[PDB]
Tab-separated table of C-alpha atoms and ligand atoms in Angstrom:
chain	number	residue	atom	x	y	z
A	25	UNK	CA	22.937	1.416	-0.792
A	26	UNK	CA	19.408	0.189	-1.498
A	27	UNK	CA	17.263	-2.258	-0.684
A	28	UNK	CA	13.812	-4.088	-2.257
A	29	UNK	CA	11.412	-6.524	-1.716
A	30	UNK	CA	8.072	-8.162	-3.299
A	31	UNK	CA	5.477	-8.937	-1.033
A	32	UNK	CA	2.504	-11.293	-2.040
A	33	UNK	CA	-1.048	-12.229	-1.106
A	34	UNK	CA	-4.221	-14.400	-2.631
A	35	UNK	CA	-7.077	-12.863	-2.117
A	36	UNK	CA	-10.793	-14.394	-1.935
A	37	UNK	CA	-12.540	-11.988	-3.827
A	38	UNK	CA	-12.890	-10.439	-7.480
A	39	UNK	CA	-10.415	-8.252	-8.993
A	40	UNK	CA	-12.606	-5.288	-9.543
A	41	UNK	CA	-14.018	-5.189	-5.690
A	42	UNK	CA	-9.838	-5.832	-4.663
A	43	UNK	CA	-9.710	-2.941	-6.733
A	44	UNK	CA	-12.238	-0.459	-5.865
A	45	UNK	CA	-10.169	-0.211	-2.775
A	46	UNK	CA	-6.544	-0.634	-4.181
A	47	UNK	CA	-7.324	2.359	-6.128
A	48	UNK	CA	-8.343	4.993	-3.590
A	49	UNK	CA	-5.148	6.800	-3.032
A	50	UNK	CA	-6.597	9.450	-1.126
A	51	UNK	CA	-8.505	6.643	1.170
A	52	UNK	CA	-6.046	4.153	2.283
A	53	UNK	CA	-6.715	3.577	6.015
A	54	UNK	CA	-10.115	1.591	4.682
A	55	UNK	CA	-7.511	-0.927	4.713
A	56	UNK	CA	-3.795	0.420	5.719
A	57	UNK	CA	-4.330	-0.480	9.462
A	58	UNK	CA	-1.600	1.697	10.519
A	59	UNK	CA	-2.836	5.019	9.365
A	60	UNK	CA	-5.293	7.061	11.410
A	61	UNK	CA	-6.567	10.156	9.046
A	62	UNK	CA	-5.112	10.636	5.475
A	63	UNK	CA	-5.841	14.560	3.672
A	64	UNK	CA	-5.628	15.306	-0.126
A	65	UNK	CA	-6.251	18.352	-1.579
A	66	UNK	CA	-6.931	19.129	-5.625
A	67	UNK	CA	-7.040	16.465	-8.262
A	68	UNK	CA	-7.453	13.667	-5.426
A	69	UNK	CA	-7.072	10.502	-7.861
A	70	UNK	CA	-4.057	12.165	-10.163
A	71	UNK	CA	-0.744	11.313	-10.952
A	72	UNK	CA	1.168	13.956	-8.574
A	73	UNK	CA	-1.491	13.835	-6.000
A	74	UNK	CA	-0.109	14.236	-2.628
A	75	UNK	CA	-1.660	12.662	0.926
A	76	UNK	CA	-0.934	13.987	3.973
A	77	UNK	CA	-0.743	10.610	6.118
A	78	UNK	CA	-1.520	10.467	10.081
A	79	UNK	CA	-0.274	7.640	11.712
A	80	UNK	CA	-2.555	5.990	14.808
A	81	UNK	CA	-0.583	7.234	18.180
A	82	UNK	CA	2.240	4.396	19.850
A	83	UNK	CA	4.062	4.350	16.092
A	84	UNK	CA	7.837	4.871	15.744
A	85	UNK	CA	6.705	8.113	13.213
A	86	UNK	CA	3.548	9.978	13.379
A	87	UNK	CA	3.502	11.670	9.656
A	88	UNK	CA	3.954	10.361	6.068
A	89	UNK	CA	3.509	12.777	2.734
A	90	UNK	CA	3.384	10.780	0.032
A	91	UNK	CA	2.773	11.490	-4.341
A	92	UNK	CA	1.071	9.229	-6.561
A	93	UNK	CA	3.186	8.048	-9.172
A	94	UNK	CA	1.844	5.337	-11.271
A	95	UNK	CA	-2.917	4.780	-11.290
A	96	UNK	CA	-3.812	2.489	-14.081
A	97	UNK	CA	-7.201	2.081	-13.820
A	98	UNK	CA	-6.748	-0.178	-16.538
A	99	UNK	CA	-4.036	-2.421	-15.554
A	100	UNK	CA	-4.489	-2.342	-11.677
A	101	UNK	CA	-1.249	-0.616	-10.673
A	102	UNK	CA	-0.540	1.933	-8.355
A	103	UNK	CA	2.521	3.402	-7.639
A	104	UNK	CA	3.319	5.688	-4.799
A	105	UNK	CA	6.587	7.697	-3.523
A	106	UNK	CA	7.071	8.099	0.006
A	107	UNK	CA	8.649	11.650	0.398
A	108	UNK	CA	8.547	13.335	3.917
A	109	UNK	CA	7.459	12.590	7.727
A	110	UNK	CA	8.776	11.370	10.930
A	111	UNK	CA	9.940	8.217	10.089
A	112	UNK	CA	13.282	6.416	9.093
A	113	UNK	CA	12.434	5.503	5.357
A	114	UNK	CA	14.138	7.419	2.461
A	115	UNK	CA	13.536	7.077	-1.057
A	116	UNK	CA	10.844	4.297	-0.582
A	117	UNK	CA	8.707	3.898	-3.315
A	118	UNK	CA	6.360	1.056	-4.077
A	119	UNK	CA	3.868	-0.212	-6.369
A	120	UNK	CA	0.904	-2.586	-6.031
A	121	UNK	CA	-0.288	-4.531	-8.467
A	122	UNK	CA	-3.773	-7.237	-8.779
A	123	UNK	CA	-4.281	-9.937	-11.088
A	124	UNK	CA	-6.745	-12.701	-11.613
A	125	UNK	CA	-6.527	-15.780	-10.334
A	126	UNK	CA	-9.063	-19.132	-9.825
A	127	UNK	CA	-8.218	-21.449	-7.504
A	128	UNK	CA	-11.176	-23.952	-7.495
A	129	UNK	CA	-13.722	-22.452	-9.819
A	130	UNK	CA	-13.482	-19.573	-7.480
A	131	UNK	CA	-12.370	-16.593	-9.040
A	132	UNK	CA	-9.818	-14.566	-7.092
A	133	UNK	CA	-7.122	-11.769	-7.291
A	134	UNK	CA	-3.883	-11.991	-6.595
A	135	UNK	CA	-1.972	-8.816	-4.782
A	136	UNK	CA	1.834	-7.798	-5.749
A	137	UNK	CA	3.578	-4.983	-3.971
A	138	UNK	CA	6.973	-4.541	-4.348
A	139	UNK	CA	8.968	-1.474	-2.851
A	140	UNK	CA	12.361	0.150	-2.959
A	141	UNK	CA	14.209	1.817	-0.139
A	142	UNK	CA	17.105	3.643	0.831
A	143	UNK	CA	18.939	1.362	4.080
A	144	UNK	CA	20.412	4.362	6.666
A	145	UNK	CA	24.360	4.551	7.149
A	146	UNK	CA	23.708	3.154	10.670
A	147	UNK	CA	21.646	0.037	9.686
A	148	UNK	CA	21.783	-3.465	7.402
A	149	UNK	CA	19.839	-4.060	4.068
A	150	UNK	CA	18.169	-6.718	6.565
A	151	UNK	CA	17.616	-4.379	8.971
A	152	UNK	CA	15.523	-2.381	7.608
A	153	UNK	CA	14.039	-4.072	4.810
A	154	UNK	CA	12.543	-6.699	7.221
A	155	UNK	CA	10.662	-4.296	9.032
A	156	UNK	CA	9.309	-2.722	5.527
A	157	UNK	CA	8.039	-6.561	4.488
A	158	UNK	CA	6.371	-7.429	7.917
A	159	UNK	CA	4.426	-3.863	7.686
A	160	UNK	CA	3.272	-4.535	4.057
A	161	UNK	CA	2.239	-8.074	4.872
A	162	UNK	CA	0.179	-6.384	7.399
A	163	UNK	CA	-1.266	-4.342	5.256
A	164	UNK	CA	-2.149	-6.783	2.763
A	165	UNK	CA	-3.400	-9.405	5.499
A	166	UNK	CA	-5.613	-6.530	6.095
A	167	UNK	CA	-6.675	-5.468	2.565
A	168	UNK	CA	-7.564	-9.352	2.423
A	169	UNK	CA	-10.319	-8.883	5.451
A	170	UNK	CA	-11.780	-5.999	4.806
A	171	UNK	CA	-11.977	-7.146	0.687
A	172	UNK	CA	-13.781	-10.939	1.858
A	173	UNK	CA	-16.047	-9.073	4.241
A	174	UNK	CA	-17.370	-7.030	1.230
A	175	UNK	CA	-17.626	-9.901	-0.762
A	176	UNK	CA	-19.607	-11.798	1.761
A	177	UNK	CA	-22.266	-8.698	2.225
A	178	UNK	CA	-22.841	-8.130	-1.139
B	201	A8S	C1	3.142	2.625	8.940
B	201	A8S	C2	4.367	3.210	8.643
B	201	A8S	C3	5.364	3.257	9.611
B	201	A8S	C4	6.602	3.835	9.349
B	201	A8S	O1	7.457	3.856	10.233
B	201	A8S	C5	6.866	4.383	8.098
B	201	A8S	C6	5.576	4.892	7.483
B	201	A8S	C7	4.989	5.995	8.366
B	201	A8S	C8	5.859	5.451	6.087
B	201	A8S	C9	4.588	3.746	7.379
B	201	A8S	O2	3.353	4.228	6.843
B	201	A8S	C10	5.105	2.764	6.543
B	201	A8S	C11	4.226	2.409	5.341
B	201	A8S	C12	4.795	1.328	4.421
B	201	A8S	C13	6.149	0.689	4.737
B	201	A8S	C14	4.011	0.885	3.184
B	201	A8S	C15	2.673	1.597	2.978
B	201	A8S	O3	2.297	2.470	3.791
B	201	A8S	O4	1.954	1.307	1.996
Protein backbone atom coordinates (compact mmCIF):
# COMPACT_ATOMS: atom_id res chain seq x y z
CA UNK A 1 0.00 0.00 0.00
CA UNK A 2 2.69 2.47 1.07
CA UNK A 3 6.01 2.93 0.99
CA UNK A 4 8.94 5.14 3.06
CA UNK A 5 12.32 5.86 3.24
CA UNK A 6 15.04 8.07 5.26
CA UNK A 7 17.58 9.59 3.34
CA UNK A 8 20.83 11.04 5.00
CA UNK A 9 23.68 13.46 4.41
CA UNK A 10 26.76 15.25 6.52
CA UNK A 11 27.13 18.40 5.66
CA UNK A 12 30.38 20.75 5.96
CA UNK A 13 28.88 23.71 7.15
CA UNK A 14 26.93 25.27 10.25
CA UNK A 15 23.48 24.48 11.07
CA UNK A 16 22.08 27.93 10.83
CA UNK A 17 23.67 28.68 7.12
CA UNK A 18 22.24 24.66 6.24
CA UNK A 19 19.32 26.30 7.44
CA UNK A 20 18.83 29.60 5.97
CA UNK A 21 18.28 27.57 2.90
CA UNK A 22 16.38 24.45 4.30
CA UNK A 23 13.88 26.90 5.38
CA UNK A 24 12.88 28.78 2.23
CA UNK A 25 9.86 26.91 1.15
CA UNK A 26 8.92 29.25 -1.38
CA UNK A 27 12.76 29.14 -2.79
CA UNK A 28 13.76 25.64 -3.23
CA UNK A 29 15.48 25.42 -6.65
CA UNK A 30 18.57 27.47 -4.77
CA UNK A 31 19.26 23.97 -4.16
CA UNK A 32 16.45 21.37 -5.55
CA UNK A 33 18.36 20.88 -8.90
CA UNK A 34 15.40 19.53 -10.55
CA UNK A 35 13.06 22.43 -10.33
CA UNK A 36 13.18 25.29 -12.81
CA UNK A 37 10.76 28.26 -11.36
CA UNK A 38 8.75 27.74 -8.08
CA UNK A 39 5.50 30.59 -7.40
CA UNK A 40 3.87 31.29 -3.95
CA UNK A 41 1.36 33.56 -3.37
CA UNK A 42 0.12 35.06 0.32
CA UNK A 43 1.72 34.13 3.59
CA UNK A 44 4.90 32.69 1.63
CA UNK A 45 6.69 31.06 4.82
CA UNK A 46 3.20 29.65 6.54
CA UNK A 47 1.96 26.50 7.47
CA UNK A 48 -0.63 25.92 4.43
CA UNK A 49 1.48 27.78 2.03
CA UNK A 50 1.24 26.37 -1.34
CA UNK A 51 4.19 26.43 -4.31
CA UNK A 52 3.46 26.09 -7.61
CA UNK A 53 6.62 23.93 -8.76
CA UNK A 54 8.10 24.00 -12.52
CA UNK A 55 10.14 21.28 -13.34
CA UNK A 56 13.43 21.98 -15.83
CA UNK A 57 12.19 20.50 -19.45
CA UNK A 58 13.41 16.43 -20.33
CA UNK A 59 11.59 15.35 -16.73
CA UNK A 60 9.10 12.45 -16.60
CA UNK A 61 6.44 15.40 -15.03
CA UNK A 62 6.62 19.01 -15.64
CA UNK A 63 4.37 20.40 -12.52
CA UNK A 64 4.34 19.81 -8.72
CA UNK A 65 1.81 21.86 -6.16
CA UNK A 66 2.85 21.29 -3.02
CA UNK A 67 1.55 22.74 1.00
CA UNK A 68 3.76 23.32 3.78
CA UNK A 69 2.98 21.26 6.58
CA UNK A 70 5.39 21.29 9.36
CA UNK A 71 8.35 25.06 9.61
CA UNK A 72 10.02 25.01 12.93
CA UNK A 73 12.20 27.65 12.85
CA UNK A 74 13.15 26.46 16.07
CA UNK A 75 13.79 22.89 15.69
CA UNK A 76 14.89 22.81 11.95
CA UNK A 77 12.02 20.81 10.46
CA UNK A 78 10.13 21.20 7.52
CA UNK A 79 7.49 19.26 6.38
CA UNK A 80 5.88 19.38 3.02
CA UNK A 81 2.83 17.46 1.19
CA UNK A 82 3.09 16.79 -2.32
CA UNK A 83 -0.54 17.21 -3.69
CA UNK A 84 -1.02 17.70 -7.54
CA UNK A 85 1.08 17.75 -10.98
CA UNK A 86 2.15 15.60 -13.75
CA UNK A 87 3.90 13.11 -12.11
CA UNK A 88 3.37 9.48 -10.71
CA UNK A 89 3.67 10.22 -6.86
CA UNK A 90 0.52 10.12 -4.62
CA UNK A 91 0.27 10.92 -1.13
CA UNK A 92 4.07 11.72 -0.79
CA UNK A 93 4.86 13.69 1.99
CA UNK A 94 8.23 14.33 3.53
CA UNK A 95 10.03 16.10 6.12
CA UNK A 96 13.61 17.37 6.49
CA UNK A 97 15.24 17.70 9.39
CA UNK A 98 19.21 19.32 10.48
CA UNK A 99 21.12 18.68 13.44
CA UNK A 100 24.55 19.43 14.74
CA UNK A 101 27.25 17.51 14.35
CA UNK A 102 31.44 17.89 14.81
CA UNK A 103 33.44 15.68 13.19
CA UNK A 104 37.05 16.92 13.91
CA UNK A 105 36.61 20.15 15.78
CA UNK A 106 34.69 21.11 12.75
CA UNK A 107 31.30 21.89 13.42
CA UNK A 108 28.77 20.50 10.95
CA UNK A 109 25.02 19.66 10.34
CA UNK A 110 23.67 16.71 9.67
CA UNK A 111 20.50 16.47 7.03
CA UNK A 112 17.44 13.88 7.62
CA UNK A 113 14.65 13.60 5.12
CA UNK A 114 12.41 10.99 5.31
CA UNK A 115 9.22 10.67 3.00
CA UNK A 116 6.08 8.62 2.60
CA UNK A 117 4.42 7.54 -0.59
CA UNK A 118 1.64 5.88 -2.07
CA UNK A 119 3.32 2.74 -4.61
CA UNK A 120 0.72 2.68 -7.94
CA UNK A 121 -1.40 -0.64 -8.52
CA UNK A 122 0.92 -1.26 -11.51
CA UNK A 123 4.32 -0.97 -9.68
CA UNK A 124 6.55 -2.57 -6.54
CA UNK A 125 7.26 -0.79 -3.13
CA UNK A 126 10.91 -1.05 -4.79
CA UNK A 127 9.87 0.30 -7.73
CA UNK A 128 9.01 3.27 -6.93
CA UNK A 129 10.50 4.03 -3.75
CA UNK A 130 14.01 3.65 -5.33
CA UNK A 131 13.48 6.24 -7.70
CA UNK A 132 12.07 8.65 -4.73
CA UNK A 133 15.62 7.91 -2.66
CA UNK A 134 18.02 8.44 -5.70
CA UNK A 135 16.08 11.94 -6.42
CA UNK A 136 16.37 13.05 -2.72
CA UNK A 137 20.00 12.01 -2.53
CA UNK A 138 20.31 14.30 -5.38
CA UNK A 139 18.89 16.85 -3.85
CA UNK A 140 20.75 16.68 -0.78
CA UNK A 141 24.20 16.05 -2.67
CA UNK A 142 23.16 19.32 -3.99
CA UNK A 143 22.01 21.22 -0.87
CA UNK A 144 25.61 20.01 0.34
CA UNK A 145 27.41 22.20 -2.66
CA UNK A 146 25.67 25.00 -2.80
CA UNK A 147 25.72 25.12 1.48
CA UNK A 148 30.04 24.56 1.42
CA UNK A 149 30.29 27.13 -1.35
CA UNK A 150 28.59 29.69 1.02
CA UNK A 151 30.59 28.70 3.72
CA UNK A 152 33.79 29.09 1.84
CA UNK A 153 32.77 32.87 0.59
CA UNK A 154 31.80 34.09 3.69
C1 LIG B 1 11.77 16.18 -9.37
C2 LIG B 1 10.58 15.48 -9.26
C3 LIG B 1 10.24 14.53 -10.22
C4 LIG B 1 9.06 13.80 -10.15
O1 LIG B 1 8.80 12.97 -11.02
C5 LIG B 1 8.17 14.02 -9.10
C6 LIG B 1 8.29 15.46 -8.62
C7 LIG B 1 7.91 16.41 -9.76
C8 LIG B 1 7.35 15.68 -7.44
C9 LIG B 1 9.72 15.73 -8.19
O2 LIG B 1 9.85 17.09 -7.79
C10 LIG B 1 10.05 14.89 -7.13
C11 LIG B 1 10.51 15.62 -5.86
C12 LIG B 1 10.87 14.70 -4.69
C13 LIG B 1 10.76 13.18 -4.85
C14 LIG B 1 11.35 15.30 -3.37
C15 LIG B 1 11.42 16.83 -3.34
O3 LIG B 1 11.11 17.49 -4.36
O4 LIG B 1 11.80 17.42 -2.31
Amino acid sequence: SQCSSTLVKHIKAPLHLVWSIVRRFDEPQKYKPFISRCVVQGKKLEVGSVREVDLKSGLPATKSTEVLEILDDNEHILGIRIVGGDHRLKNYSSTISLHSETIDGKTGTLAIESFVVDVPEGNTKEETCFFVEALIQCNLNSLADVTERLQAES
